[PDB]
Amino acid sequence: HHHHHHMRKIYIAGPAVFNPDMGASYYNKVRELLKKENVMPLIPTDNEATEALDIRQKNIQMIKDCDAVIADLSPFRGHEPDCGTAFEVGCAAALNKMVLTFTSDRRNMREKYGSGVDKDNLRVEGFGLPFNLMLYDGVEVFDSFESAFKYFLANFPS
Amino acid sequence: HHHHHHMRKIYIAGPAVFNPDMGASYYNKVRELLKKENVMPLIPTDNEATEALDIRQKNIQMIKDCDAVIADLSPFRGHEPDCGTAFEVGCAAALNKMVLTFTSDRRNMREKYGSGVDKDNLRVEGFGLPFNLMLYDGVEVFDSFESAFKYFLANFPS
Ligand SMILES: CCc1ccccc1CO
Ligand SMILES: CCc1ccccc1CO
């Protein structure tokens, strides 16, 4: 009786932080969706420090503390995902965390660039993936945050 | 007598792999520099598998096996570093590896974009750093592979 109850936590990785509203609209939608399932979002800007190294450490700790990462690997400033998000995906991988990724553009990299090379003749990966192969771990690449969250609910029960 | 001798190993993270020569010129220069100090480069394309997941796994293993990562965080396809490299930096951070980074462009992000926002009104970080703050861990951002390697030699002796 009155056993400790673990509340599931998801690290919310993605470039929404760079939206004009600092991600407020995205994070509010995430908060509402997760609240209904008693899941807590771990949001990069929560209780935000002022020093870069402190912000980084807190975010790494959030990844250490999470049950899963849902990472927004949508195009950011071109066809490539956000590198901060990519760092967080790598951190989670090394820690053997469940990593779920989504993108607004699921086309293969060569489809996105329209060629096997970019405008500067740099090679575009040819592995039938939407982004750098390091970011793919065998789990399906989802279309949306919501679809990734549905996978979480099915595969990480309370 | 005849004790085991550890050979130092550095994971060579960076978008050189996307050069037309698949990084041959960069990697050859790296090989020559490291050879002189009895350091072994762990190069992403070494004994390259055909399947994305196998390539990724081998690269993660190289990071697990390394003494340090030297990561090329130079602009790739714009002002942002390569996301594969960023993933690898994240992996290394979580594994408490020595991470050394360099870039061909050390200007602050806001200097690079010329503004506190990009062309789409997305926020450019203002922390006096050349790239996404997750990629900075307190170690100096170097100007070149060689300068990062000199730091390695000074701070990771045999
Ligand atoms: C200010 C940008 C920010 C905020 C929270 C966590 C990470 C970052 C940059 O990666
Ligand atoms: C084929 C490109 C490549 C090769 C080795 C390791 C990683 C990658 C892409 O991230």
Could you please report the per-residue DSSP string of B23-89? THHHHHHHHHHHHTTT-EEE-TTTT--SSHHHHHHHHHHHHHH-SEEEEE----SSSSPPHHHHHHH
A84 interaction partners in chain B (CB closer than 8 Å): 86, 132-135
- Residue whose CB lies within 8 A of the most ligand 1 atoms, among B89, B118, B134, for a mutation test: B134
Tell whether A84 is within 8 A of chain B (Cβ). Answer: yes
Tell me how far apart the alpha carbons of residues B43 and B65 are, in angstroms, rounded to a whole number: 12
Method: X-ray
Which residues 6+ apart lie within 8 Å of A12 measured at CB? A27, A30, A41, A42, A43, A44, A70
The three-point CA angle B103-B138-B104 to 5° equals 5
Contact by Cβ (8 Å): B79, B109: yes
What are the C-alpha distances in Å from A71 to residues A5, A38, B46, B88? 26, 20, 29, 16
Query: Any alpha helices (H) in B79-131, and if so which ranges?
Result: 83-94, 109-113
What fold characterizes domain B1-158?
Rossmann fold (3.40.50)
Contact by Cβ (8 Å): A130, A137: no
Q: Which of B149, B154, B145 is nearest to B9 (CA)?
A: B149
Q: What are phi and psi of A113, to 5 degrees?
A: -80, -15
Four-point Cα dihedral B80, B82, B88, B91, nearest 10? 40
Q: Which of A43, A129, A44, A45 is nearest to A80 (CA)?
A: A129
Q: How many CA atoms lie within 13 A of B69 on its CB side?
A: 31
**How many Å is the maximal CA-CA distance in chain A?**
65
Tokens 């450490």 correspond to A57
Contact by Cβ (8 Å): A81, A131: yes
- Record the tokens describing residue B76, joined without a space: 């790739």
Q: Which ligand is nearest to the CA of B49?
A: 2
- Record the tokens describing residue A13, joined without a space: 């990785």
Tell me how far apart the alpha carbons of residues A144 and A88 are, in angstroms, rounded to a whole number: 18
